[PDB]
Every structure is written in structure tokens, then in C-alpha cells.
Design a protein around this ligand. Structure first.
Ligand code: CHL
Ligand code: CLA
Ligand code: CLA
Ligand code: CLA
Ligand code: CLA
Ligand code: CLA
Ligand code: CLA
Ligand code: CLA
Ligand SMILES: CC(/C=C/C=C(C)/C=C/[C@@]12O[C@]1(C)C[C@@H](O)CC2(C)C)=C\C=C\C=C(C)\C=C\C=C(C)\C=C\[C@@]12O[C@]1(C)C[C@@H](O)CC2(C)C
Ligand SMILES: CC(/C=C/C=C(C)/C=C/[C@@]12O[C@]1(C)C[C@@H](O)CC2(C)C)=C\C=C\C=C(C)\C=C\C=C(C)\C=C\[C@@]12O[C@]1(C)C[C@@H](O)CC2(C)C
Ligand SMILES: CCCCCCCS[C@@H]1O[C@H](CO)[C@@H](O)[C@H](O)[C@H]1O
Lengths: 212, 61, 163, 41, 207
């Protein structure tokens, strides 16, 4: 198996079948078998918020080239409550209400996979029952196109794509933060700035990353 | 008389296990003054986990 | 009023006591031009200190001759004459603070008692079992009465004595 | 990770960690709610 | 069987025996049997007061604020502390205490000795009883329910009692903050749901 840092062998505990398992645990935090399935969900969740976050940053940025007046991802928080029309408290506290429902629901299917779709949440049996893997609910709502139902050999082949596209969305979304704190400008602005004058726009020239 | 492994309460006035449960490791069939030998999970001051008693003192529960 | 005292708001030495501190403080911060944080840090404390004075005067504490707020123990005095917040209320707070950790220490010793060797279980805590007790300990007043009346709180007469 | 937990469960560790959770909390309660003589608020 | 949250526990000492049991007792107050017996009655007595009581808060203020028809004297439920007229609060209070405490010690000494609060000689006259444990029946069920819907009726008492208790606490905390009446707190939210929410005022607003 094509491990990272070729020439070594994977940590002996995880050689197993996990989508996108390259044998990378250099601090050995999967050593607890009970805890590993908790990290596998932890990644899957971050990978899914990443891939939504990245597009959510780039598109309003890319939208701004043609005009169309959007903000950058930073200071899009202000611009909305600048124009407001609903208070900040009501919004953040509707978050915690609706959002906390899903997560605290998402959790007790991880704890005990049987419940959450036994029934008696507005019916909806088998939509929430979960398909048995850690971070994959499946079902009617979460899976409207009925994918991950037919051929499994094609499914396991998506589960790999999802992670590998997720691990990249995270590692890019670390760039959006870091290259904002330095250049103080949007992600697609930088993607033009370096594509225009690559030589003087590079990382060493932001005056922050390379202090003197 | 009393039998091995069965729990016991000890009424011996001078003791660290007085009124404290213990398990007989062995009982002798003999005329020994202090035949029965108990064993306690607790530790004495001396570090002693076992002692011999008389039949008149040991009582089984 | 009570016990030959006066509410600190209508006190006098208390008002000296408040306004003598700011003077000694401000005469100190005249040594720092406002471009220094020490000019700000001292300022912020003078405004911080005056807040508490308007708080102590308002809340109705009783300052004796010295101008320092005293307290009053007796319920029949604190309650009837209106200020019980000195002890009478927080003496309830503490007991629920202290008994909670008190009774949460008893269950853990029970839960960890029956085992092969409880000793190693006292050194090395299993935090989940300790968490289930920290949770279960709440409402100990109602759970103490019940171990009290059911007879499960005491260990009765198999205790050991000497002579 | 098995044995790292069991060490973190030793008596002095929790004694440090859990007091530093009170200590910190009791410190910050005094940051936002300063100078609490009586329960008057 | 319904659970408070579907994935957790149903604690060992608690099975689904009694009605209104969804398996929620985090602090584990009831454990030994002779206690759980007690609290079950403590719930219903609350659940029953809360239902009746809340309607004392809800409806009178509703009438007044739902129109001119029969405006409620005493205004909002916490403005009816005033408007005693005939008798002084010193006496009218200790008339209650003496009067209630007769009936409610009768209720306890029944829980203590279940069969008969009062057997036919003592407490002259009266003593009809016809009493099962945990519910009085007898006098207190005049129309003669427990016609075979009991189990359902039992579930319908608790589940409404559970809610009126919880809803009552809102009346307290709301009025303690917004200083308005419930339908004032009601409509003002229903008017504009966002700005008139909680947590925009005084309480989570500490932020
Ligand atoms: C969870 C990820 C998350 C990230 C990375 C950000 C990022 C940011 N938000 Mg933001 N937000 C996030 C969640 C949310 N925000 C908002 C609504 C806002 C508002 C109104 C504002 C921000 C602002 C900010 C900035 C930091 C605020 C600050 O005090 O910095 C110092 C530490 C930064 C650009 C501020 C901003 O726009 O500054 C550039 C700002 O005014 N956010 C909501 C709705 C309640 C969120 C829900 O989770
Ligand atoms: C017109 C109204 C009226 C009504 C409805 C009643 C009804 C009753 N009277 Mg009566 N009574 C009346 C007028 C009335 N009385 C008048 C005008 C006088 C005086 C001339 C009396 C003098 C009187 C006496 C002397 C006796 C009754 C008794 C009774 C009870 C007999 C029933 C029984 O044995 O069942 C079982 C017994 C019951 C009491 C059923 C319980 C029903 C209710 C809930 C009990 C209420 C009792 C009352 C509140 C006690 C407190 C008042 C008192 C201590 C000052 C019955 C409740 C007998 C009794 O024991 O009551 C005092 C009795 O011996 N009556
Ligand atoms: C979780 C990811 C995420 C988050 C938190 C945000 C956050 C934000 N986006 Mg955004 N966005 C994202 C992903 C995300 N984006 C993606 C993937 C795209 C590409 C399609 C966009 C495209 C986009 C545009 C074009 C705009 C924003 C804007 C905004 C800001 C205001 C949101 C608003 O008013 O609309 C809230 C609107 C709704 C909640 C309507 C819901 C409609 C759905 C389809 C129906 C019901 C929702 C259901 C539960 C799903 C806010 C900072 C606005 C901005 O920059 O400020 C002006 C803006 O104009 N977003
Ligand atoms: C060691 C026990 C103890 C002692 C010595 C006192 C002493 C006192 N109590 Mg107290 N009390 C106690 C325990 C105690 N309390 C407990 C545990 C409770 C249960 C809640 C009460 C409940 C209580 C009530 C409800 C009342 C008292 C009152 C009093 C006063 C009684 C009359 C008197 O002595 O002159 C009276 C005292 C003075 C004139 C001096 C006033 C001192 C100023 C206000 C300080 C006196 C200050 C009565 C009272 O307030 O007296 C006015 C009163 O009404 N007490
Ligand atoms: C949590 C367990 C626990 C409980 C329920 C008690 C209960 C009691 N102790 Mg005690 N004690 C404990 C731990 C505990 N102790 C420890 C750990 C020590 C020292 C190593 C002592 C030292 C001690 C002395 C010297 C005396 C008592 C006394 C008493 C009695 C009066 C209460 C009192 O004033 O104590 C006051 C408490 C102290 C002075 C020290 C307590 C310090 C804290 C509470 C210990 C830490 C608790 C532990 C970390 C909890 C872990 C919880 C977690 C595992 C879930 C009461 C029966 C007194 C007595 O017998 O009078 C009747 C008495 O003279 N105890
Ligand atoms: C044993 C005697 C004793 C007593 C009764 C007190 C009592 C008090 N001290 Mg104190 N102190 C003591 C010994 C004592 N101390 C010692 C020995 C020292 C030297 C180390 C100090 C040094 C000291 C300082 C330096 C300060 C205090 C302060 C205080 C007051 C603030 C309490 C607090 O944080 O709010 C109560 C805190 C809470 C309620 C937080 C708990 C919140 C939880 C989540 C509630 C949950 C409920 C469910 C309080 C009256 C502070 C003060 O302002 O005094 C005027 C202060 O700044 N003390
Ligand atoms: C003289 C009047 C009087 C007396 C003797 C009682 C006696 C009792 N009430 Mg009570 N009660 C009364 C008036 C009275 N009530 C009034 C006026 C109300 C308001 C409507 C209530 C509301 C009430 C509720 C809501 C509950 C009780 C409960 C109880 C029982 C336990 C009380 C307790 O825990 O004490 C503790 C000791 C002190 C408070 C001191 C006990 C039999 C409880 C009960 O029966 O549980 C099964 C219960 O849940 N009572
Ligand atoms: C099931 C009972 C119930 C219902 C229907 C409502 C309904 C309402 N409450 Mg309310 N409330 C309740 C219980 C309830 N509350 C309780 C128990 C408390 C104390 C913890 C409060 C404390 C409270 C405050 C402080 C305020 C409201 C407000 C409101 C109104 C705006 C919605 C809101 O902010 O609620 C928030 C609801 C909660 C925080 C509790 C969750 C309710 C659960 C999830 C429903 C099941 C709305 C009519 C606000 C209002 O009308 O302003 C004008 C307002 O200021 N309530
Ligand atoms: C989830 C995520 C991003 C989510 C983005 C979101 C929600 C978007 C938010 C926004 O749209 C809003 C809300 C409003 C917009 O206007 C603005 C923003 C704010 C942009 C990033 C995760 C980012 C997470 C990252 C980058 C993590 C990198 C972790 C690494 C490399 C860890 C490696 C190791 O752990 C292993 C693998 C194994 C161990 O043995 C060794 C070590 C080293 C410990
Ligand atoms: C009875 C009650 C309210 C009664 C109100 C009455 C009579 C109102 C009367 C009035 O309005 C009128 C009639 C007219 C007005 O003019 C006068 C007044 C006087 C104003 C509230 C109970 C209120 C009771 C409440 C809110 C209880 C909430 C309990 C919860 C949330 C959970 C509790 C737990 O016990 C469990 C379930 C499991 C444990 O493990 C965990 C814990 C937490 C211990
Ligand atoms: C994470 C900060 C708190 C430190 C304690 C968390 C682990 S809890 C820990 O879990 C181990 C699992 O093998 C047990 O062996 C151990 O007894 C238990 O205390």
C-alpha cells in the first residue's frame, strides 16, 4: 500500500480498511481502538465542512471580479449585520438551537447506531437509521439521489474520493486563513496577484511570513 | 468445626480485625489452642494479612 | 440602627474611606503621561474601585464607626431587618457546594469498592466512573435523606473498636 | 494511547488538572463579577 | 418505548413501569423503591397545581388582552398580589395554612398507611374514601372516569402536567425580565419574531 513517507511501514495498529488510509499517525493517536472510530468521524465531518467552506470562500471572491458587489469571506460577517434587519443575538441563538439539534442527534447515532430512526421522531424510520458506517448516514434526506445504494464497488471508490478531496479542502482552507492574515486580501485576489506578477507577489514578499 | 473459605466475623478483643470479616484459609482437625487461620484483605499495622484464632472467638457469617 | 450601626451609604468614615483611596491613587498616576499604559491601568482601577463603593452603599451593608462594612449572623436579624445576603443566603450556597463534593466522594468509594483490589482504583481514578458520580451527586440533599431513612447511609455496628 | 490515558488518570495528575479548572474558573468569575462580598446582585 | 433522547440509557433502576416514564433521571434522585413511590406523588401534586394554577395566569390576562369583554381585575398574574379587599393578609393567610394543612396531612398519612386515611368511626361523618393508592378516586373522580381508558388517561394527565409545570416556569422568568404579561410577551414575539426573541434582552445578552 502506498504509504506516506515511502520506505517505512505503517503503524502496526492501522493497516486496516479505512477510506484513504495511508498509514499516517505520527503521534499515534489512533492507538486506542475505541477512539479511532471517533477520529474517523471527526475527519469526515471536518472534511465535509471544509469542502463547503472552500467553495463558500472562493465563489463570492470569484464573483467579485465581474463586479456584483459581494464581500470577501472575511468581513462578510459585518456586511450582513451592517445591513442587519435581524439582530445578531437572535441569529447566533437560532444557530445553537437548530444546529445543536443535528449534532446532538448526529452523536447518539454514533454512540448507539440502533436508535435515531427506530421511529418516533415524526416517523421517518430508515431515513435516519444510518447505513452502519461511522460518518455515513445514507438514507432518504441525506442521500436524495439514491447513490451509495447500487454497486458497492463503485461506492467504496467514492468514499476514497470524498476523503482525499476533503483532506485537500482542509489543507487549502488552512491557506485561506494564513494567507489572509499576511496579505490581507481575498483568496481569488491572491490567485490573480500571483498569476499577474508572480515574482514580487510570492510568499517571501508579504513582509509577514518572512520577518527581518 | 468451621470450614475453609467460608466468611467469618472475629470478636477477639485485641486485634486489628476485631468485628471485621475474614475468610478462613484453613481449619485444623487437631487439639491446637488456636487452630483456625483466617485471611483478611486489609493490612495490619505490622503488615500482617493473616492470623490464627481460637474456636471460641471466630464466628461464621 | 441595628446594634448601633448605620448603613454604609449614609455612613461618613466610609465616604472618607472611599474618597481617600482615589486621591492617593490619582496623585500617583499624575506621574505617567497618557501615552503610557500605566496612566490607563491606574485610571481603570480608580474607576473600578468607585464602582464597588456605589455597590456597597447601595446594597445596604452596615458600617460601624470605622466605616468598614460588618455582617450579622442571626437569621432573625438578617432576615427581618432585610439583609441576609451576608451569610444566611451564602451559608446555604456553601453547604450545597461542600456537600456536593462531600457526597460525590462517598458514591465513588462505593462504586469502586467491590472489585478484585479497590486499592489501585483509588490511586488511578477511572474518570468515567468518577463522572457518573459527579453527575449523580447533584440533588444530594434528597439523596442523603433517603440513604438516611432507608438505613443505607450508616454502616451500623460492624465497626471496629478497641477495648 | 491506552497507557497514556492510564497515566493521566493517576492521582496527582487529576489533582493538578482539576484544581487548575477550579482555580481558573474561580479566578475568572472574579474577572467579570469583581469584589463579591455579599450575595446582593 | 419512547425515550427522552432516543439513544441513551433508561437507567437500570428505572424500567418503563409507571406512566409518563421516558427514562430521564440524570441526577438519579429516585433509586431505592420507597423513594420513587414518594416522588411520583410529588410530581402529580405539582402537575395538578401547575395545570390549574397556570390557567389562573393564562386565561384572565388573556380575556382582558383579547378584548374589552370581562377585563381581569388584578391585571397581570403578578399584579393580583395587590387587590386583597375584605380580610387582612395576616389572617387570610393563616386561615389558608390551617385549612389546607388539614387536607394535605390527610393526603400524606394516606401515603404512609395506604388502605384507609380514615376508617369509618374516626373523623365523624365524611370518610367516603373508595381510595386506590397514588390516585384518590372516590369523591375526587365524580363523573366516574377510569372507564377503561385509565392507562391512556394516566398518560394524558402527566404529559399535560409535565408541560404546564415547565410552561409555568416560563411565566415566572419571562415576567421577571420583560415586565410584561404573557400575551404581551406572546404577541410581541409573534409580531416580529427576531428582535422580540429571548437572548436579545438582558439575560443571554450578557453574551
Ligand atoms: C466557525 C467559523 C467562523 C470563522 C472562521 C469566522 C470568521 C470570522 N468572523 Mg464570523 N466566523 C465564523 C463563524 C461565524 N461568524 C458569524 C458572524 C460574524 C459577524 C457579525 C462578524 C464575524 C466576524 C468574523 C471575523 C473574526 C471575528 C473576531 O472577533 O476576530 C478576532 C478574534 C472572522 C473573519 C467579524 C468580521 O467580519 O471581521 C472581519 C464580524 O463582525 N462573524 C456567525 C453567525 C453568528 C458564525 C457562525 O458560526
Ligand atoms: C341544607 C344544607 C345541608 C346539607 C347539604 C347538609 C348535609 C349533611 N349534613 Mg347537615 N345540617 C344542616 C344543613 C345541611 N346539611 C342544617 C341546617 C343543620 C342544623 C339545623 C344541620 C345539622 C347536621 C347535623 C347535626 C348532622 C348533619 C350531618 C350531615 C351529613 C350527613 C351525611 C352523612 O352521614 O354522610 C357521611 C357524612 C358526611 C358528613 C358526608 C361528607 C360530606 C361533606 C363533604 C362533609 C362536610 C361537613 C362539614 C364541612 C363539617 C364542618 C362544619 C362544622 C364542623 C362546623 C351531610 C353532609 C351529619 C354529620 O355528620 O355532619 C355534621 C350530622 O350528624 N347535619
Ligand atoms: C456552510 C457554508 C457557508 C456559510 C456558513 C456561508 C456564509 C455566508 N454566505 Mg455563503 N455560500 C456557500 C457556503 C457558505 N456561506 C456556498 C457553498 C456558496 C456557493 C453557492 C455560497 C454563496 C454565497 C453567496 C452568493 C452569498 C453568500 C453569502 C453569505 C453570507 C450571508 C449568508 C446569507 O445571507 O444567506 C442566508 C440565506 C439563506 C439561509 C437562504 C437558504 C436557502 C436554502 C437553499 C433553503 C433552505 C436552507 C436549507 C437548510 C439548506 C454568510 C457569510 C452572501 C454574502 O456574501 O453577503 C451578501 C451572498 O450574497 N454565500
Ligand atoms: C445559638 C443560637 C442562637 C442564638 C443565641 C440566637 C439569638 C437570637 N435570635 Mg436566633 N436563630 C437561630 C439561632 C440563634 N439565635 C437559628 C438557628 C434560627 C433558625 C432560623 C434562628 C431564628 C431566629 C428568629 C426567627 C428570630 C431570632 C431572634 C433572635 C434574638 C432573640 C431575642 C433576643 O435574644 O434578643 C433580640 C436581639 C436583639 C434585640 C439584638 C439585635 C441584634 C442586631 C439586630 C444584630 C437573638 C438575637 C429573634 C429576633 O430577631 O430578635 C430581635 C427572631 O425573631 N432567631
Ligand atoms: C471525599 C471523601 C470524604 C468524605 C465523605 C469525608 C467525610 C468526613 N470527614 Mg474526611 N477526609 C477525606 C475525605 C473525605 N472525608 C480526606 C481525603 C482526608 C485527608 C487525607 C480527610 C481528613 C479528615 C479529617 C482529618 C477529619 C475528617 C472528618 C470528616 C467527617 C466530618 C466532615 C468534615 O468536617 O471534614 C472536613 C474535611 C477536611 C478537614 C478535609 C477534607 C478535604 C477534602 C474534602 C478531601 C478531598 C476529597 C476527594 C478528593 C474527593 C474525590 C472525589 C472523586 C474521587 C469522585 C466526615 C465524616 C473529620 C471527622 O471525623 O469529624 C467527624 C476529621 O476530623 N476527614
Ligand atoms: C476561610 C475563610 C475565607 C472566607 C469565608 C473567604 C471568602 C471570600 N473571599 Mg477570601 N481568602 C481567604 C479565606 C477566605 N475567603 C484566604 C485564606 C485568603 C488568602 C489566600 C483569601 C484571599 C482572598 C482574596 C485575595 C479575595 C478573596 C475574596 C473573597 C470573597 C469572594 C468569593 C468569591 O469569589 O465569590 C463567589 C464565587 C462564586 C460564586 C463562583 C462560583 C460559581 C459557580 C459556577 C456557581 C454554581 C452554582 C450552581 C469571599 C467573601 C475576593 C473578594 O472580593 O473579597 C472581598 C478576593 O478578591 N479572598
Ligand atoms: C399547614 C399547611 C401544610 C402542610 C402541613 C403541608 C404538608 C405537606 N405538603 Mg404541602 N402545601 C400547602 C400546605 C401544607 N402542606 C400549601 C398551602 C401548598 C400550596 C398549594 C402546598 C403545596 C405542596 C406541594 C406542591 C407539595 C406539598 C407536599 C407536602 C408534604 C411534604 C412537605 C415537605 O416536604 O415538607 C418539608 C418541610 C418543610 C418545607 C418545612 C407534606 C405532607 C409535597 C408532597 O406531598 O410530596 C409528596 C409536594 O410535592 N405541598
Ligand atoms: C414550552 C413552554 C414555553 C413556550 C411555548 C415559550 C414560548 C415563548 N417564550 Mg418562553 N420560556 C419558557 C418556556 C416556554 N416559552 C421557560 C421554561 C422559560 C424559562 C427558562 C422561558 C423564558 C423566556 C424568556 C426569558 C422569554 C421567553 C420568550 C418567549 C416567546 C419568544 C420565544 C422565545 O424566546 O422562547 C425561548 C424559549 C426558551 C429559552 C425555552 C425553550 C422552549 C422549548 C425548546 C420548547 C419545547 C415565546 C412565546 C421571550 C419573549 O416573548 O419575549 C417577548 C422572552 O423574552 N421565554
Ligand atoms: C473545517 C475547516 C473549515 C471550515 C470552513 C468554514 C466552516 C467556512 C467558514 C466561512 O464561510 C463562513 C462561515 C463565513 C464566510 O464569510 C467566511 C468563512 C469563515 C470562511 C477547516 C479545517 C481545517 C483543518 C486542518 C487544516 C487540519 C490539519 C491537520 C493536520 C495536518 C493534522 C495532522 C495530524 O493529526 C494527524 C493527521 C495525525 C497525527 O498523528 C499527526 C497530526 C499532525 C497531529
Ligand atoms: C407547580 C408549579 C407552579 C405552580 C404555580 C401556581 C400554583 C401559580 C399560582 C398563581 O398563578 C396563580 C394561580 C394566580 C396568581 O394571581 C397567583 C399565583 C400564585 C402567581 C411549578 C412547578 C415547576 C416544576 C418544574 C419547573 C420542574 C422542572 C423539572 C425539571 C426540568 C427536571 C427535573 C428533575 O427531576 C427530574 C425530572 C430528573 C432528575 O434526575 C433531574 C431533575 C432536574 C432533578
Ligand atoms: C483527557 C483528560 C482527562 C484524562 C483522563 C481521560 C481518560 S479516562 C481513562 O481511560 C482509560 C482507558 O483505558 C482507563 O484505563 C482509565 O482508568 C480512565 O481513567
Amino acid at each position: 500500500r502506498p504509504v506516506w513517507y515511502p520506505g517505512n511501514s505503517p503503524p502496526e495498529w492501522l493497516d486496516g480498511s479505512l477510506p484513504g488510509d495511508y498509514g499516517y499517525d505520527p503521534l499515534g493517536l489512533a492507538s486506542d481502538p475505541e477512539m479511532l472510530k471517533w477520529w474517523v468521524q471527526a475527519e469526515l465531518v471536518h472534511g465535509r465542512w471544509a469542502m463547503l467552506g472552500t467553495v463558500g470562500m472562493i465563489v463570492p471572491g470569484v464573483a467579485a471580479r465581474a463586479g456584483g458587489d459581494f464581500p470577501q469571506w472575511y468581513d462578510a460577517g459585518k456586511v450582513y449585520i451592517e445591513n442587519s434587519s435581524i439582530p445578531f443575538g437572535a441569529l447566533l441563538m437560532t444557530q445553537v438551537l437548530m444546529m445543536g439539534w443535528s449534532e446532538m442527534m448526529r452523536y447518539y447515532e454514533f454512540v448507539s447506531p440502533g436508535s435515531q430512526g427506530t421511529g418516533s421522531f415524526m416517523g421517518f424510520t430508515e431515513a435516519f437509521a444510518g447505513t452502519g458506517e461511522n460518518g455515513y448516514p445514507g438514507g432518504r434526506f441525506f442521500d436524495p439521489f439514491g447513490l451509495a445504494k447500487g454497486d458497492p464497488a463503485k461506492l467504496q471508490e467514492y468514499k476514497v474520493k470524498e476523503i482525499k478531496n476533503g483532506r485537500l479542502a482542509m489543507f487549502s482552507c488552512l491557506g485561506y486563513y494564513a494567507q489572509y492574515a499576511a496579505t490581507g486580501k481575498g483568496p481569488v485576489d491572491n490567485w490573480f496577484d500571483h498569476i499577474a506578477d508572480p515574482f514580487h507577489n510570492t510568499c517571501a514578499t508579504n513582509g509577514v511570513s518572512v520577518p527581518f | 468445626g468451621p470450614k475453609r473459605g467460608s466468611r467469618v466475623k472475629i470478636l477477639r478483643p485485641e486485634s486489628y480485625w476485631y468485628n471485621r470479616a475474614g475468610k478462613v484459609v484453613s481449619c485444623d482437625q487437631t487439639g491446637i489452642k488456636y487452630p483456625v487461620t483466617v485471611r483478611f484483605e486489609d493490612v495490619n499495622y505490622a503488615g500482617v494479612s493473616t492470623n490464627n484464632f481460637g474456636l471460641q472467638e471466630v464466628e461464621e457469617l | 440602627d441595628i446594634a448601633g450601626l448605620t448603613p454604609c451609604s449614609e455612613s461618613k468614615a466610609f465616604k472618607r474611606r472611599e474618597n481617600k483611596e482615589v486621591k492617593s491613587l490619582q496623585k500617583r498616576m499624575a506621574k505617567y503621561e497618557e501615552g503610557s499604559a500605566p496612566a490607563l491601568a491606574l485610571q481603570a482601577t480608580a474607576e473600578r474601585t468607585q464602582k464597588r463603593f456605589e455597590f456597597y452603599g447601595k446594597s445596604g451593608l452596615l458600617c460601624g464607626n470605622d466605616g468598614l462594612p460588618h455582617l450579622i449572623a442571626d437569621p432573625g436579624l438578617a432576615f427581618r431587618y432585610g439583609h441576609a445576603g451576608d451569610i444566611m443566603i451564602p451559608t446555604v450556597l456553601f453547604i450545597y457546594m461542600a456537600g456536593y463534593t462531600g457526597y460525590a466522594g462517598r458514591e465513588y468509594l462505593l462504586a469502586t469498592r467491590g472489585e478484585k483490589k479497590p486499592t489501585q482504583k483509588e490511586i488511578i481514578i477511572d474518570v468515567p466512573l468518577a463522572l457518573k458520580c459527579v453527575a449523580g451527586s447533584a440533588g444530594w440533599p434528597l439523596r442523603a435523606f433517603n440513604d438516611l431513612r432507608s438505613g443505607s447511609l450508616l454502616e451500623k455496628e460492624e465497626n471496629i473498636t478497641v477495648s | 494511547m491506552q497507557n497514556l490515558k492510564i497515566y493521566l488518570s493517576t492521582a496527582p495528575v487529576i489533582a493538578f488538572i482539576w484544581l487548575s479548572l477550579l482555580s481558573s474558573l474561580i479566578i475568572e468569575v472574579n474577572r467579570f463579577f469583581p469584589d463579591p462580598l455579599i450575595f446582593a446582585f | 418505548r419512547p425515550i427522552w433522547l432516543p439513544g441513551a440509557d433508561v437507567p437500570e433502576w428505572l424500567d418503563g413501569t409507571i406512566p409518563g416514564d421516558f427514562g430521564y433521571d440524570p441526577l438519579k434522585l429516585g433509586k431505592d423503591p420507597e423513594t420513587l413511590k414518594w416522588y411520583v406523588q410529588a410530581e402529580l401534586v405539582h402537575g395538578r397545581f401547575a395545570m390549574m394554577g397556570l390557567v389562573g395566569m393564562l386565561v384572565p390576562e388573556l380575556l382582558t388582552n383579547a378584548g374589552i369583554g370581562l377585563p381581569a381585575k388584578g391585571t397581570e398574574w403578578f399584579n393580583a398580589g395587590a387587590a386583597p379587599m375584605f380580610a387582612p393578609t395576616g389572617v387570610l393567610f393563616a386561615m389558608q395554612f390551617l385549612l389546607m394543612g388539614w387536607a394535605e396531612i390527610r393526603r400524606y398519612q394516606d401515603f404512609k398507611n395506604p388502605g384507609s386515611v380514615n376508617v369509618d368511626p374516626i373523623f365523624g361523618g365524611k370518610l367516603p374514601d373508595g381510595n386506590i393508592p397514588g390516585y384518590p378516586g372516590g369523591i375526587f373522580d365524580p363523573f366516574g372516569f377510569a372507564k377503561g381508558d385509565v392507562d391512556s388517561l394516566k398518560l394524558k394527565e402527566v404529559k399535560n402536567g409535565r408541560l404546564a409545570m415547565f410552561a409555568t416556569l416560563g411565566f415566572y422568568c419571562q415576567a421577571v425580565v420583560t415586565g410584561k404579561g404573557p400575551i404581551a410577551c406572546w404577541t410581541s414575539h409573534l409580531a416580529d419574531p427576531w428582535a422580540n426573541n429571548v437572548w436579545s434582552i438582558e439575560l443571554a445578552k450578557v453574551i
